[PDB]
């Protein structure tokens, strides 16, 4: 599944993604850490908060 960024988010650790409104995050997986997702943006994989994004359907 892919997700679309709806709200800007800045990474606070090196394993999170810095993401921007309109960007598509690819190959997105739900994680054990509740409220967090993992996917790929501009070649890099990291985690980002799920309420900044919306699942493309």
């Amino acid at each position: 599944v892919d997700y679309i960024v709806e709200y800007d988010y800045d990474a606070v650790h090196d394993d999170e993604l810095t993401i921007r409104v309109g960007e598509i995050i690819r190959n997105v997986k739900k994680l054990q850490e509740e409220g967090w997702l993992e996917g790929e943006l501009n070649g890099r994989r990291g985690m980002f908060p799920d309420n900044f994004v919306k699942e493309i359907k």
């Binding site: 709200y7 988010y9 850490e33 509740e34 309420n51 900044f52």
Partner: peptide
Amino acid sequence: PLPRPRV
């Protein structure tokens, strides 16, 4: 830990 950042 990781919070759940707020919109």
